[PDB]
Design a protein around this ligand. Structure first.
Ligand SMILES: CCCCCCCCCCCCCCCCCC(=O)OC[C@H](COP(=O)([O-])OCC(O)COP(=O)([O-])OC[C@@H](COC(=O)CCCCCCCCCCCCCCCCC)OC(=O)CCCCCCCCCCCCCCCCC)OC(=O)CCCCCCCCCCCCCCCCC
Ligand SMILES: CCCCCCCCCCCCCCCCCC(=O)OC[C@H](COP(=O)([O-])OCC(O)COP(=O)([O-])OC[C@@H](COC(=O)CCCCCCCCCCCCCCCCC)OC(=O)CCCCCCCCCCCCCCCCC)OC(=O)CCCCCCCCCCCCCCCCC
Ligand SMILES: CCCCCCCCCCCCCCCCCC(=O)OC[C@H](COP(=O)([O-])OCC(O)COP(=O)([O-])OC[C@@H](COC(=O)CCCCCCCCCCCCCCCCC)OC(=O)CCCCCCCCCCCCCCCCC)OC(=O)CCCCCCCCCCCCCCCCC
Ligand SMILES: CCCCCCCCCCCCCCCCCC(=O)OC[C@H](COP(=O)([O-])OCC(O)COP(=O)([O-])OC[C@@H](COC(=O)CCCCCCCCCCCCCCCCC)OC(=O)CCCCCCCCCCCCCCCCC)OC(=O)CCCCCCCCCCCCCCCCC
Ligand SMILES: CCCCCCCCCCCCCCCCCC(=O)OC[C@H](COP(=O)([O-])OCC(O)COP(=O)([O-])OC[C@@H](COC(=O)CCCCCCCCCCCCCCCCC)OC(=O)CCCCCCCCCCCCCCCCC)OC(=O)CCCCCCCCCCCCCCCCC
Ligand SMILES: CCCCCCCCCCCCCCCCCC(=O)OC[C@H](COP(=O)([O-])OCC[N+](C)(C)C)OC(=O)CCCCCCCCCCCCCCCCC
Ligand SMILES: CCCCCCCC/C=C/CCCCCCCC(=O)OC[C@H](COP(=O)(O)OCCN)OC(=O)CCCCCCC/C=C/CCCCCCCC
Ligand SMILES: CCCCCCCCCCCCO[C@@H]1O[C@H](CO)[C@@H](O[C@H]2O[C@H](CO)[C@@H](O)[C@H](O)[C@H]2O)[C@H](O)[C@H]1O
Lengths: 53, 105, 383, 62, 103, 231, 135, 80, 85, 168
């Protein structure tokens, strides 16, 4: 019932990828999180200014 | 250890600068470079072609550690004895009056 | 695809007509290749004609270099047409498989006959010429697509895992390109967003440094026989030749806009040879055109300007991403209402399990407080 | 790796788990075989074999 | 998705593992096996007596002699060998009869 | 001569089948260094440096099933022969060596010629190259010899001490009832302490020797690995 | 075409012997599939009870095999060599005599290298039979 | 505590002192097996697997098995 | 000695003996049977693999001219250093 | 014709009964060894020539170009001569499986053909021999079976000090 994880793990192991830790990808994706409303407001203002200019 | 980069054509010193067992084999002695092993080793080191020294050695060891070692141990010819049993060259010949079978035809 | 008796009968019936058609195609493709090779030798760059050597920086092993040993003949349309190029590519595939089979036959004498029976029972490694009707051709294409599905995910996972484990992207745009490159085919990938991954991987690995296992997976995904694989510079040469022909044809089409005038079946075949459009997807002309335009955009303006395509490894990953179907999920959600460890209910809980339940159950706070207070009292008494 | 499991506090608790019950039975066997050997092999009526000097392993392996 | 370990059957996975994953190791193992069976697959009767028995060779019944006797009887009976032939005995049949009458 | 015998793992095979019919995580490994060869990021190798993981894990499992369980009395180490261990180490070591040699990259051996250009080539560097080429094979032989001798000596010592303990326990326990009971009690306590110490030492040494056995192979592999830097 | 290379080609139904298999898996999982059952390279589990149960069983069956199959050979050799050099000669004795001889062999085993040597070395002047008694 | 090399696991506290002090203990809700719970002897009140079967009884059973194993041949010897 | 005897395999079941000549001859018969059929030409790699190395080894054995004596491989007694026969 | 299948039994028998190996048979086997070495040498020369012919132009320039290891002058002259000879005309320089086939199949065919015909030659030579080995070869080709103990059956010649066994 979580097929993507299963397929990725099986393929990684079948291609000699025994290691279970990916520090680099985690570092790229660790700080990802849904933004706050105020952050959304700031981003929308930036986009509007860019579109206007 | 680290990556190896082949030297450029301009970075290779001249042959005359190489030294042999006693001294450089310059003009009037160039043909002696073929026979001088140490001169060839120094030339290879100067040309960064050190593998010519290392590859034959290691492989040889392997060849002795793998195939020739056991061949010598199991089938090698030991030292001959003092009193030798030479062959009289009398065995094998067919006896008199024997009728050998005809050859294929 | 697994072998079957019906396919065995089909291939046995069409064996000799298939061989005759293969011989005719061999003559035609020899003519086409003679033209192409003469043009390459005459007008090709000095490095390409002389086969310049490109060695790896670690073990100094020669391999084909994308920039030097691959050349796009922009003026090939004068001598050779697009259809001739496609015919040559198809014949190259068929000839590779037939050559492997013939080599096996020559090596093993008459002992390859049962292996030939196994071979004819499956359409995976038989030539296209063995199909004399539309239904047979459709089944053969289905088998090839099945093999591509079987092979491609391993190649994609190999590439992605190695890069992510041993390196990371430099900037955010490269990160987005890398992440979006390996998305499943159910979503549409923007070639402009994905292109920088080519430069990133060129920084990581070029086509000249491709490892033998990744090469084997790629050749599996390209329906190229791999046994005997041998050194990596043989199937590597095959891949280089195939993609050079494909790039020449692509330049011809882009310059002459042939795909717009190309018919539906020919367009589908053109996309299929690029590993973009599986036949089992039943794509229409709109989807085929979209995928072809995306492929051309990924090639980029520099391809037309100078005949330089992006990194071949990343290109292969991108095109094969259309065969990376979403992971299968079958079964109604109601199945999640069941239990998996009912067979253990009869065993119950032992003393240790009961202790764990008591300590970490809803009464955990009370037990922790009581235990800590008792320990503190005992420690105070000891002092 | 010796991480966890039932651990009786003292002897009397070995009967609170079947596995430790089998363990204590085995320990009883182990420790009680020695007194049996003491009694059997130091018995008054035990007699050395008269023909013990006829043959021995020492001459065989020599 | 397809994976060799999960989808292929055991013999197929074995062949793949030892042909495209560890082929050199398999080759070396076969080489060593051949060497062992070519140079370390013999045991003389004296060696068997010295070390070939757990408690020692039971000379009081000499099972090696019985084994060889059975071997030779079987060979002679099956192959129809005339052990009285002069080559086996070094003397003619008439000389053998003379010796039998003498002793 | 063809001898038919069986290994002493049948019960352990049964237990493996029983307890591993379902998946279980593995987080503790005797030789973890086979999984982490590279420690500085952005370094990558085009060689199959992770090919040794499966063999390492299987060897660890096999040798642990044999050696660790051998501490149990009467348990047999069926593979305990000098030349059999030689064959095993020969297989592994020579297989990796031929994998490196089949690469047909002679420059890979440039490091065998020890020293710099200042040193005399014939009388110093060549001799050092000879010694190092010999030292590779000596490392193989030493690995197998160490693995054999550790087990042999440990089990010899255990057998002898157990025999002595049995003798004193059986034929001198009556001293407990006699006036010299204190001497017997002291000797018995010393024997118990020695028993515990020997068992702990053997337990630790088996695992350590497996670690070293795998580390020698990994060092062979690492001696010929070259790492490229990402750009 | 004759045999499938894929494990998906089933040879039996999914419900074949479901109950016994579930019982076997229940036996396997109850003690092993736990957080504290952390194995060291799959050979050394973390559950104490596994050790407590398996060590005695292994020792018991190994000892039974050794006693009834391995040391029996040495015991029989001693009995045969010391009492005629033939099996029939030993069988000529009574069960009690065989018991005495075997227990003396056990004594010798227990003494090993840490005991008196008169058990196998004949002191000068001893009247007991020597090595050439049956020769 | 320890039994030879087997050590009893101990749960790490998770609550702070301030929060812990506010917890009200009500042993009435606790199971009868664990009342007056003691970390140094949590299984004191744990039920026996078999009623009336003491640890000493099993130890004596093993000792009797050893005695049988060593003495049976003395009473019922068998010929070679 | 006795402690040394504890390092032996404990599950020996059966031992079989066979002369080198006999099983070598049987193997040769099998190889001839499988390499005889006409549909395997002599120039095929399989046939050469089967035959050439064996022929080379046997020729090397025949050509051998050693000044020393090599005792018979399958003597009854090979443990006496002072009796090669 | 497949001579190896017939000759393997004969070779094994000769090894088992090598005592009766006359000097003529020893010379025959030495000649067979010499011809095997010659076939190996010629096949290797052919393989080297095919490899050199199919080598890439840049590869040839690198191999037969500067620098000179010895720099005697003859080395450079020879390398330049070979390079010019190879690069003057057009050469088919395939890569991958094609080069493998081109370089190997001719070499394998040559070596196998030479060895097979030399084996036939050795069979004829042993047929023409007047020794016990020749008689055994003729009997093998006649009846199709190897007759062991033949030398003692027909009383082949023995040293003067070992004729007692025939004394019957
Ligand atoms: C009888 C003796 C037998 C000996 C034992 C043999 C044992 C079996 C071994 C295999 C032998 C070959 C089998 C047949 C293959 C078919 C012919 C062929 O090469 O196809 C092209 C094709 C070339 O592949 P590629 O990757 O495209 O080539 C890249 C090049 O850059 C390509 O260059 P390009 O890009 O410029 O393109 C050129 C292309 C352009 O042309 C075209 O595109 C047109 C099409 C041309 C090819 C058509 C092939 C058709 C194949 C099918 C045939 C029908 C089969 C019917 C089966 C059913 C029958 C009932 O034309 C070519 O394909 C030319 C290739 C070069 C010629 C190779 C042949 C050399 C040997 C023949 C001469 C021998 C002379 C002996 C003299 C003796 C003197 C004493 O062949 C292959 O697919 C490769 C073979 C695959 C199997 C490999 C198995 C291992 C081989 C190891 C050999 C080692 C040495 C031998 C000893 C072995 C000991 C163990
Ligand atoms: C639980 C227990 C269960 C039972 C276990 C049984 C016991 C097993 C114990 C041992 C197992 C491991 C053994 C490992 C050994 C070492 C392997 C090694 O070092 O390999 C390195 C290396 C690894 O190979 P690779 O190419 O890198 O990739 C291998 C992957 O598997 C390629 O994978 P891929 O995915 O990349 O490609 C897949 C696909 C890709 O598709 C294709 O490639 C297209 C189709 C290609 C067809 C074949 C083309 C062949 C072209 C010519 C090859 C050169 C010939 C040389 C001259 C002939 C020499 C004999 O290819 C195929 O589907 C290949 C189909 C082959 C079917 C045959 C497999 C063997 C089954 C048994 C039959 C023979 C039984 C004999 C014994 C019984 C007799 C009564 O080997 C090679 O380079 C291959 C050389 C092949 C030379 C020919 C065979 C020589 C061996 C003797 C043959 C004797 C024939 C006798 C006939 C009958 C006489 C009566
Ligand atoms: C002349 C006297 C007889 C002997 C003749 C011998 C001829 C020899 C020819 C010359 C050979 C020269 C070279 C010899 C080298 C030997 C080297 C050696 O020993 O190395 C040690 C080495 C020790 O390895 P290991 O680490 O102990 O592991 C091997 C084990 O097999 C365990 O490994 P594993 O567990 O990993 O193996 C996989 C295992 C995976 O696990 C399992 O499958 C579990 C089961 C394991 C079975 C195998 C273990 C055997 C245990 C001992 C015997 C069991 C009891 C037998 C009772 C016999 C009673 C007389 O699966 C199997 O074993 C598959 C077979 C399963 C059979 C199931 C059959 C079910 C039948 C049901 C019938 C129901 C009928 C109902 C009717 C109702 C009507 C109303 O041995 C080997 O590696 C194998 C050597 C074999 C060499 C080939 C020999 C030729 C074949 C002979 C077959 C004879 C069959 C006829 C016998 C008839 C009775 C007398
Ligand atoms: C790529 C791989 C990389 C990875 C490697 C991995 C492994 C590690 C490496 C180390 C090896 C480990 C060992 C593993 C086990 C392998 C199996 C094994 O050990 O078997 C040995 C095993 C040893 O034999 P054995 O069973 O112990 O029996 C001993 C008997 O001798 C057997 O009797 P037989 O009847 O078989 O005859 C054998 C014969 C073998 O030889 C022959 O049959 C004849 C020669 C064959 C030549 C082959 C072609 C060479 C090239 C030809 C020319 C090309 C250029 C043409 C154009 C020229 C233009 C001008 O040898 C001899 O008996 C010695 C005869 C020597 C005569 C010398 C006469 C004096 C004058 C010549 C020398 C002195 C010249 C001074 C000049 C001074 C100038 C100032 O087999 C053999 O060695 C013989 C059979 C195989 C022969 C193969 C021949 C080709 C060898 C390769 C040559 C090319 C590559 C090397 C150069 C590369 C440069 C880049
Ligand atoms: C049943 C059949 C049994 C068959 C047995 C025979 C063996 C197997 C047969 C073939 C099996 C099929 C597969 C073979 C491997 C395929 C490899 C591959 O993929 O190549 C692609 C590759 C195509 O790629 P490419 O891009 O076109 O070019 C490659 C790049 O240059 C690549 O660029 P790169 O950057 O990599 O450049 C480096 C490259 C550069 O090399 C090349 O690629 C160039 C081509 C090779 C040149 C080799 C010759 C070098 C010069 C030799 C000089 C010798 C002088 C001796 C003088 C002696 C005087 C007394 O590699 C090297 O540097 C390696 C050099 C070789 C070193 C050899 C070291 C040997 C050590 C020996 C140790 C001691 C041994 C024992 C003791 C012996 C003495 C007692 O193919 C080739 O280049 C040539 C392939 C040739 C295949 C082998 C043909 C076999 C013919 C057999 C005939 C005889 C049959 C006998 C039958 C007997 C009865 C059964
Ligand atoms: C009480 C005494 C104790 C003594 C103890 C001594 C130590 C024993 C140690 C044993 C255990 C350790 C073993 C490690 C491995 C050793 C390996 C070893 O030495 O093996 C050598 C041995 C050498 O074999 P050989 O002994 O038959 O050699 C034949 C040589 N003549 C004919 C001259 C006698 O290898 C083998 O036995 C395997 C041979 C078959 C496999 C290889 C075939 C290919 C050969 C290629 C070259 C030649 C053909 C041409 C090319 C190919 C053409 C197709
Ligand atoms: C190929 C045979 C050609 C000649 C015809 C022979 C017919 C002999 C009579 C057979 C009657 C019984 C047939 C029962 C069904 C067999 C089904 C079968 O073969 O399945 C193989 C199946 C395994 O299948 P999987 O690989 O898991 O997946 C299969 C899907 N791809 O194998 C089995 O389970 C074994 C079944 C054996 C059945 C008996 C086969 C006998 C064959 C004998 C051939 C020799 C000639 C016989 C002549 C007889 C004349 C009276
Ligand atoms: C494609 C090539 C085809 C070649 C066809 C034949 C070419 C013409 C014949 C070539 C020469 C043959 O001459 C050959 O000489 C050598 C000696 O040098 C002889 O060899 C003899 O003396 C050598 C001396 O070392 C001994 O090792 C050898 O055992 C012995 O037989 C060969 O028996 C003979 O055959």
């Amino acid at each position: 019932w979580c097929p993507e994880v299963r397929d990725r793990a099986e393929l990684e192991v079948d291609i000699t990828g025994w290691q279970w830790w990916s520090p680099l990808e985690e570092r790229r994706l660790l700080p990802v999180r849904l933004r706050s409303v105020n952050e959304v407001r700031e981003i929308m203002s930036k986009t509007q200014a860019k579109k206007s200019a | 250890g680290e990556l190896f980069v082949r030297p450029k054509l301009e970075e290779i010193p001249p042959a005359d600068q190489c030294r042999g067992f006693f001294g450089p084999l310059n003009d009037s002695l160039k043909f002696l470079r073929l026979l001088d092993i140490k001169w060839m080793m120094n030339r290879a080191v100067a040309m960064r072609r050190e593998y010519l020294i290392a590859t034959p050695t290691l492989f040889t060891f392997i060849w002795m550690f793998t195939w020739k070692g056991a061949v010598i141990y199991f089938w090698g010819d030991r030292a001959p004895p003092r009193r030798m049993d030479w062959n009289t060259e009398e065995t094998g010949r067919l006896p008199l009056g024997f009728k050998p079978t005809p050859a294929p035809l | 695809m697994q072998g079957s008796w019906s396919v065995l009968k089909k291939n046995c019936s069409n064996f000799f007509p298939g061989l005759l058609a293969f011989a005719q195609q061999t003559q035609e493709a020899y003519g086409i290749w003679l033209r192409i090779y003469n043009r390459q030798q005459k007008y090709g760059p000095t490095d390409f004609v002389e086969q310049s050597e490109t060695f790896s920086p670690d073990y100094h092993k020669r391999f084909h270099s994308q920039d030097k040993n691959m050349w796009v003949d922009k003026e090939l349309c004068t001598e050779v047409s697009q259809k001739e190029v496609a015919r040559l590519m198809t014949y190259k595939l068929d000839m590779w498989r037939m050559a492997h089979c013939a080599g096996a036959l020559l090596a093993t004498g008459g002992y390859a006959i049962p292996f030939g029976l196994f071979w004819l029972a499956n359409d995976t490694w038989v030539p296209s010429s063995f199909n004399l009707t539309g239904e047979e051709l459709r089944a053969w294409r289905e088998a090839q697509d099945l093999y591509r599905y079987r092979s491609a995910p391993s190649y994609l996972t190999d590439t992605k895992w190695h890069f992510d484990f041993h390196a990371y992207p430099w900037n955010e745009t490269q990160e987005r390109a890398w992440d979006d490159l390996f998305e499943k085919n159910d979503v549409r990938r923007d070639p402009k967003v994905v292109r920088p991954a080519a430069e990133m991987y060129d920084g990581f690995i070029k086509f000249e440094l491709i490892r033998r296992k990744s090469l084997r997976h790629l050749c599996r995904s390209m329906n190229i026989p791999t046994f005997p694989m041998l050194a990596r510079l043989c199937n590597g040469t095959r891949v280089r030749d195939y993609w050079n022909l494909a790039w020449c044809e692509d330049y011809m089409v882009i310059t002459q806009r042939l795909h717009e005038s190309m018919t539906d079946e020919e367009l589908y075949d053109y996309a299929w040879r690029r590993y973009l459009a599986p036949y089992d997807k039943n794509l229409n002309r709109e989807q085929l055109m979209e995928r072809v335009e995306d492929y051309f955009e990924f090639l980029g303006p520099d391809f037309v300007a100078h005949g330089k395509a992006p990194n071949l490894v990343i290109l292969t990953n991108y095109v094969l991403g259309y065969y990376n179907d979403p992971a299968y999920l079958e079964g109604d959600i109601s199945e999640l209402d069941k239990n998996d460890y009912d067979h253990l209910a009869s065993w119950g809980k032992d003393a240790f399990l009961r202790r764990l339940e008591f300590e970490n159950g809803p009464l955990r706070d009370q037990v922790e407080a009581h235990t800590q207070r008792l320990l503190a009292e005992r420690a105070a008494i000891a002092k | 790796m010796l991480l966890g499991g039932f651990v009786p506090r003292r002897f009397s608790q070995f009967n609170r788990d079947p596995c430790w019950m089998f363990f204590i039975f085995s320990v009883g066997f182990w420790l009680g075989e020695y007194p049996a050997m003491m009694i059997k092999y130091n018995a008054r009526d035990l007699v050395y074999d008269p023909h013990r000097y006829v043959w021995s392993h020492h001459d065989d392996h020599h | 998705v397809y994976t060799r370990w999960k989808c292929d059957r055991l013999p197929v996975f074995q062949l793949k593992l030892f042909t495209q994953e560890y082929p050199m190791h398999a080759a070396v193992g076969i080489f060593t096996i051949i060497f062992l069976w070519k140079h370390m697959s013999h045991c003389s009767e004296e060696t068997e007596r010295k070390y070939g028995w757990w408690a020692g060779y039971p000379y009081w019944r000499d099972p090696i002699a019985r084994r060889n006797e059975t071997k030779y009887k079987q060979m002679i009976i099956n192959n129809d060998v005339d052990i009285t032939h002069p080559k086996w005995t070094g003397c003619s049949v008439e000389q053998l009869e003379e010796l039998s009458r003498v002793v | 001569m063809f001898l038919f015998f069986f290994c002493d793992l049948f019960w352990l095979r049964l237990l493996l089948c029983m307890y591993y019919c379902v998946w279980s995580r593995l987080c503790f490994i005797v030789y973890f260094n086979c999984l982490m060869l590279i420690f500085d990021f952005l370094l990558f190798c085009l060689f199959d440096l992770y090919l040794f993981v499966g063999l390492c894990l299987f060897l660890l499992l096999w040798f642990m099933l044999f050696n660790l369980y051998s501490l149990i009395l009467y348990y047999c180490i069926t593979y305990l022969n000098l030349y059999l261990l030689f064959c095993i180490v020969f297989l592994l070591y020579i297989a990796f060596l031929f994998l490196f040699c089949f690469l047909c990259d002679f420059f890979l051996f440039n490091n065998l010629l020890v020293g710099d250009s200042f040193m005399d080539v014939f009388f110093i560097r060549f001799l050092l190259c000879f010694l190092e080429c010999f030292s590779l094979l000596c490392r193989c032989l030493s690995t197998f010899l160490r693995l054999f001798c550790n087990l042999l000596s440990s089990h010899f010592l255990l057998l002898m001490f157990f025999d002595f303990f049995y003798f004193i326990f059986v034929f001198f326990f009556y001293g407990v009832f006699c006036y010299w009971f204190i001497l017997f009690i002291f000797v018995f306590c010393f024997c118990l302490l020695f028993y515990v110490f020997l068992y702990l030492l053997d337990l630790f040494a088996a695992i350590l020797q497996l670690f070293i056995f795998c580390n020698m192979i990994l060092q062979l592999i690492m001696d010929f690995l070259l790492f490229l830097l990402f750009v | 075409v004759l045999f499938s290379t894929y494990r998906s080609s089933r040879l039996v139904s999914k419900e074949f012997l479901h109950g016994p298999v579930m019982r076997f898996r229940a036996l396997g999982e109850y003690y092993f599939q736990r957080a504290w059952n952390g194995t060291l390279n799959w050979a050394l589990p973390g559950e104490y009870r596994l050790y407590a149960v398996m060590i005695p069983f292994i020792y018991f069956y190994h000892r039974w095999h050794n006693d009834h199959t391995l040391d029996r050979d040495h015991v029989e050799k001693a009995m045969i060599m010391r009492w005629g050099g033939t099996l029939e000669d030993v069988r000529k004795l009574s069960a009690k005599d065989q018991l005495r001889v075997r227990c003396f062999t056990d004594i010798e085993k227990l003494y090993s290298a840490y005991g008196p040597k008169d058990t196998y070395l004949q002191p000068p002047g001893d009247t007991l039979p020597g090595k050439d008694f049956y020769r | 505590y320890n039994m030879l090399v087997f050590r009893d696991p101990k749960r790490r506290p998770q609550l702070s002192e301030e929060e812990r002090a506010k917890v009200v203990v009500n042993q009435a809700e606790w199971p009868e097996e664990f009342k007056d719970f003691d970390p140094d002897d949590p299984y004191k009140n744990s039920p026996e697997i078999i009623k009336g079967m003491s640890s000493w009884n099993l130890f004596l059973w093993g000792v009797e098995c050893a005695f049988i194993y060593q003495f049976y041949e003395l009473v019922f010897p068998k010929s070679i | 000695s006795n402690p040394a005897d504890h390092f032996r395999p404990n599950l020996k079941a059966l031992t079989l003996y066979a002369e080198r000549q006999h099983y070598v001859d049987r193997w040769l018969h099998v190889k001839e049977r499988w390499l005889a059929p006409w549909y395997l030409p002599w120039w095929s790699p399989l046939f050469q693999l089967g035959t050439w190395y064996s022929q080379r080894s046997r020729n090397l054995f025949l050509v051998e001219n050693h000044l020393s004596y090599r005792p018979y491989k399958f003597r009854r007694n090979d443990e006496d250093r002072n009796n090669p026969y | 014709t497949k001579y190896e299948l017939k000759m393997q039994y004969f070779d094994e028998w000769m090894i088992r009964w090598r005592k009766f190996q006359t000097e003529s048979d020893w010379e025959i086997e030495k000649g067979r060894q010499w011809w095997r070495r010659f076939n190996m040498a010629v096949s290797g020369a052919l393989f080297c020539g095919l490899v050199l012919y199919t080598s890439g132009t840049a590869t040839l320039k690198r191999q037969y170009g500067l620098p000179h290891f010895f720099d005697i002058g003859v080395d450079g002259q020879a390398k330049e001569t070979m390079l010019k000879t190879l690069t003057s005309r057009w050469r088919y320089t395939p890569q991958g499986y094609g080069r493998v086939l081109i370089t190997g199949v001719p070499t394998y065919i040559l070596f196998v053909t030479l060895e097979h015909y030399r084996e036939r030659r050795r069979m004829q030579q042993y047929l023409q021999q007047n020794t016990v080995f020749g008689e055994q070869m003729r009997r093998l080709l006649s009846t199709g079976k190897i007759e062991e103990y033949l030398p003692v059956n027909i009383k082949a010649t023995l040293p003067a000090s070992q004729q007692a066994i025939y004394n019957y």
